[PDB]
């Protein structure tokens, strides 16, 4: 009569456009459409919201998608995964969404040569620029590893010691930290840009 363990749901906000809470219900001996419900703490509305867009993986629910109008950043997100055939098998998680925001990868990588010993890299991230920090990796075709540099809300990196006879490669990614949140996972890497020959 002991209730079975439930899968753990992983929620992530992607560029404050939507939220994907996903789980893997392939552990069940009998397959079941697990149901998702959610609400917010420090909120006078004591109402439980059912999932509006379930995600399916082989005819069984494998997650839920919340639209932007359903996301309350900076309010504690309580998500409840429940077994419909047995309501006693339920699990609730309390999440802080400001630490689970994942922005898109930086876009529009441009290089601008100011002098023969100074060139700058520029990018934009489809996101409030003052809420993102950035990491710039670069390497030449004669470098064994990468070279990273942290860039703040100013989206400008100046290449130290430019060598015109070497071909460079640049990539940048962003993270929702630390001014507007405390996220730990970075965004995906941007497409690589190149310079020189």
């Amino acid at each position, epitope marked *: 009569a002991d209730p079975l363990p439930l899968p753990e749901v992983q929620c992530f906000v992607f560029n*404050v456009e939507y939220m994907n809470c996903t789980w893997n219900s392939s552990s069940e001996p009998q397959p079941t459409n697990l149901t998702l419900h959610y609400w917010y703490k*420090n*909120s*006078d*509305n004591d109402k439980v919201q059912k999932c509006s867009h379930y995600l399916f993986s082989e005819e069984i629910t494998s997650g839920c998608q919340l639209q*932007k*109008k359903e*996301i*309350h*950043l*900076y*309010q504690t997100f309580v998500v409840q995964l429940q077994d419909p055939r047995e309501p006693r098998r339920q699990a609730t998680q309390m999440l802080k969404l*400001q630490n689970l*925001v994942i922005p898109w990868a930086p876009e529009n990588l441009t290089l601008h040569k100011l002098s023969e010993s100074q060139l700058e890299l520029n990018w934009n991230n489809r996101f*409030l620029n*003052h*809420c993102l920090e950035h990491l710039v990796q670069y390497r030449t075709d004669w470098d064994h590893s990468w070279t990273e540099q942290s860039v703040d809300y100013r989206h400008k990196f100046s290449l130290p010691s430019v060598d015109g006879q070497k071909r460079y490669t640049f990539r940048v990614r962003s993270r*929702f930290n630390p*001014l*507007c*949140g405390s996220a730990q996972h970075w965004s995906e890497w941007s497409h690589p840009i190149h310079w020189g020959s």
Partner: nanobody
Amino acid sequence: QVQLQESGGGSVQAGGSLRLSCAASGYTYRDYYMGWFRQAPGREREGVASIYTRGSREGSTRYSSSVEGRFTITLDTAKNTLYLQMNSLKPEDTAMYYCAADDRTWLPRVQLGGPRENEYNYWGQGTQVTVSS
């Protein structure tokens, strides 16, 4: 859509006190964030204080470092009126004070200091505060 209208401004000697009022009207059920901004003569507008309306007064307020411990922002949910108690006013507080309200629960917001201007959709007309020695 909310409609804000400030009041309670004036000209006060240095060290005096003041209390602004900003009555909200319209769709006051969906404005989750409210704040106060001020604009000094010839200078850009800056955030003073911010508050989350539906919290339980548990860390739901944020103030600028320039007014911390001197200004307090409150909210009367029954009358739909925002307040900003101002004490120990110095001449640097002379500015045009605006209240603002926002309905975007998903919007990122600065968690250190006064509110940014981009974090609010609806604004009031303003009230003038003049502090002289």
